[model samples]
Target chain A: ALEARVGHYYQMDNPYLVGREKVREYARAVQDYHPSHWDAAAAADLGYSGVVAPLTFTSTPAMACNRRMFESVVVGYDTYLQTEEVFEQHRPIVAGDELHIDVELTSIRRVAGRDLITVTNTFTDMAGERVHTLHTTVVGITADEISPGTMAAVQKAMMHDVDSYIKTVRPAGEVRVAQDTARNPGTPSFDDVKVGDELPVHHTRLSRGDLVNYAGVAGDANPIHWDEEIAKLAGLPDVIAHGMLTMGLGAGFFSAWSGDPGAVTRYAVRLSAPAIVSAAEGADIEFGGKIKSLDPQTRTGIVVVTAKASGKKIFGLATMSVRFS
Target chain B: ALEARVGHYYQMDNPYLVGREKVREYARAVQDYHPSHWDAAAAADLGYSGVVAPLTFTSTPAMACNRRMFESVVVGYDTYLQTEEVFEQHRPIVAGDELHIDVELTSIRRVAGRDLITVTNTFTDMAGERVHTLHTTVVGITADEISPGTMAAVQKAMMHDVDSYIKTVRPAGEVRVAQDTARNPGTPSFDDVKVGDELPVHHTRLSRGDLVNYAGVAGDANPIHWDEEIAKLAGLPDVIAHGMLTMGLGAGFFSAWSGDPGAVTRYAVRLSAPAIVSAAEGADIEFGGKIKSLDPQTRTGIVVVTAKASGKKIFGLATMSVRFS
Candidate 1:
């Protein structure tokens, strides 16, 4: 029944105005301290009009816009497990930009007896140009998979919905992919980069407090990220960090090495395992990447990224497509 | 030693730009459904240029501005318990307003053998008009009061700090209180209101997810609000809701009855107890209020507000000063 709902599309009635402080707040949540994301002067120096948003920042609004799809369109599921995410940045969003966001049920596939659902969000600027595209894939779990105790707990522990009074569905129209024409003067020159170049290994920490902060910052309400009892009831060893947060960390890790946040054109990550964060010891993730391939004509290259925590590979396979100077 | 630092004041170098979506996000965190906070048309009808911020919205920026006062100035405390909060709205802040925030160590007093530290935050608009004043009072708890386990656990669970590199203190100058002259035509006429008018009793529910959302939305990273283990170690029976959040709910409850968010000029809440949230059951807050007195000359009235949770009074002698007509 759910497989037939592919191509379901809708748009938010109002535009989301990006606040200057919110960029700083989101940057702080992901621990992304790149100067361009914080300092306007630094961003201007890199050819941006304002403070640049981190690569995964669009996920925040995408999650908000996808609530209707998950609650109204995708039914018969007790819960969902995030498995993969892809971000396409046609243009880097900055503070003061007004964005109109929409969501579409891109695809649904059956894999190994599990249903994998993919929802795509498109963010358009006031100039009528699509700036960002986000694709989220999750595994749907039915009532049989979740324990009865968890249903009762989640029912009580979940926040009530504050639905918007306005609803204006978009008319069916032609779909056009956003084109990229931005400069990457801040990145390394094409002649200075080559394949097989390894990025420095960096370690990032995730505390329960960090998860709690991200839950609020990103508006993700799943209890498995902070509540141990709920997590255990849902069949987990202990509390776990948010998958989006880990992806956010990985994006920041890549940008720190790439020299500019706007240099990246596309990022994709596939989650293989969860990063268990215990009460006594928070999880620590090690991030490393290497240039996988290069293209001389487009001055673009692919970088393969890896992340591990608690001796387990958190990201199965991650790659980024970036434009060089 | 901390008392000597009373009156220490400093101002933030940059201003906080309020975002339209942020107002809606914060309104949702407090479960506020008032149209003034969400709908721009409704806000315009109520005499606001844009979406009106909730009364407790200032606390978000106040908490950020006060970090320096707490970390660098107020020392020797393992943790602090929020006791009282006062909000003075010289004028209601609206979306798109840029506010410069400052913090001052207002006073220190010993009450019932406990030290109460008060910090004040002032928010000024781009026009150099003070739009809001927020006072926060907290009880300082020493090392002996907290367990070693809590300290170690909090250390691991706590997120790392991301401090700004800029610092510019305001020079000493003549202090002037912000004047109020904005119209509040949305409220009932003064002749129609009288003393002892009762407000409808409203019940507000809060889940663990709500608290987690508030933590990130408000930039508050206290684990006692979400981490059960840390809350237990802190001597709480269970995870408790944030005092600011409860205050936010009360403010919303008031606005729902008052017909206008900007009509209220002042709100003061003294927290007598916490609303405890459990794994299975969240928290329910009952809010009720009535007019205590009225002044014909100023066309203002005092409201006596009561809040209770779990058969316990959560607020002690809470009051609001609002303009009628």
Candidate 2:
């Protein structure tokens, strides 16, 4: 059957003209409010043709095409995990252009007791000039192959208990929220601060609106952060927050504490766990920092951050290095 | 000589995972309004767990693949009208599905200074199940000529419209965010009241048109933003701008006044009320800020922001932090 799929190909008999119609909204969905994405004047500053798109935003066409055309048809398997993806671009995809999609099925195989699929998508403009290319690998397995016991356990990880997980998740408007009086930890005296002093805690109430708004600004659109059905398919109970958002919210604490956002010269963290700030009960994180070490000569401090959701840790090795001067 | 290449094959190697709102965004992009495309309740009634996508959505994936075709050789082609295309679907695409595309080049030939190509697009779901097949026949004519695309002026105006916002916005008598080099207006490095000083009022007029444009790019289709009937059905007075939309605008003031969005070390807000405006021309919302507290340790100045439509506050505790230079 894998061999049977090797030679399949398709192209748009007619190509649709791409315009600025969705550029603004697409930028918003990616949480990109850069003037370059909205105003050609801003783009002119950067020497682009017009309203330019973020790199990841260009994948909209390809993703929409595959799911709309094929997702309804997978008979035996209901799950898939992406293994690899490569994007190669020859020219910037401008705001308005007539574009056609051409697709080819390169290969299919079975390895490690699962199905492997390889696909390549080509984008050509009105002039038949090639503009972009994408390559990907997908491995899929049957839904029934996942144990029922394992499914229930995975559900608890996302939500404590929903009315029911299959369809009814929480709405963005229903979430609880809180923000405290502003507290600025003015300039830190490098000589006075010790290695173990605790930085003031920063608390934030997370909501779906917060996530959606942040997504519009960040340009990262992984479904696990928004769609419950997709989240469950990915083996989660519901939509979760982006790993980078968690790190970002935590990282900014150092700047707030240091009195300058630019004070953080180096920031590094690993997503140790998924933060289940799902739609319902819009989650919250209690974050703070402890001075790990400080060098007065270098005027820098190594601060370790603490971020927790549902009283559990959401980030590992969450740390930042900030400059004092 | 070109007929020597007929059986070439290509494939997009990765699978794209779909999200719920993305379906809505794509629907908006394509200007399609079938309820199943955006509303979960509507889709559930139609037997879908979430959004049930439209068939044309299939073309997007292939389009994405086509953009990925750049590294391949540039083949000379004459422009040809698409003669035929037919879609055969095995099932309806539902939310939370993984889909892959396999493309096959069926045949290629030339006649009358033209190149004719027939290709098939095959979509497979995560279950390793084939879902849809799109077969296309395209004849090419003007492959050498280049068209720069007709980006309509309306869309062109929109891409750069935000550049005019500062000139078109509300009255400045009570401007909260000021551009003066000094925080206190009419004075250089002037003295200002301490922690309890309330800034002048900042008024913003919003209308149905604003909401329409905001709705266009927010990727948020919640009826509360534009539809009066839907807003009433959801227990509201009328349509409203997203809380975050208002919040983001107000939040930028701190940066506007401080001279940099990058300068804000911390910005936070809690949604307390929906900013309701009129359906006619537009309505107005007034916001201001007051110094909350200053942490001299870090020279960090903190201000609590105020937002309201009808003399009542909109934010529970809008707060921001900027370095006190």
Predictions' DockQ, in order: 0.76, 0.01
> In model 1, how well does chain A match by TM-score?
0.95
Candidate 1 Cα misplacement greater than 4 A, ranges: A164-182, B164-171, B175-180
| Per-residue C-alpha lDDT of model 2 across residues A1-325, encoded as one tens digit per residue | 5464464565645453344535554554433455555676756554556565443444556654455223433334544544444444445455665567766666667887978776666777766676666665566657677655443333322211101112121123331211111222134768778899998887756555445444433333344554455467567766677664565456445544664432344455544456776533666787888999988787667888887888778766656666554
**What lDDT tens digits, residue by residue, belong to model 1 across residues A107-200?**
8898898999999898989878888989999999988897777877877777666673233345767655556465555878889988999999
Query: Candidate 1 on B1-325: residue-level lDDT in tens?
Result: 5467777788889889998989999999999989999999999988889999999999999998888888778777877889999999888999988999999888889889788999999998988888899999999988788877777777777777667323334576765566555665577778998798899899998888888889899988888988888899998999999999999999999988888888888999999989997767788899999999999998888999999988999999899899888
Error of 2 at B139 (Å): 56
DockQ of 2: 0.01
Count of clashes, each model: 0, 62
Q: TM-score, chain B only, every model?
A: 0.95, 0.42
- If you score just chain A, what TM-score does every candidate get? 0.95, 0.51
Worst 10 residues of 1 chain A by lDDT: A161-170
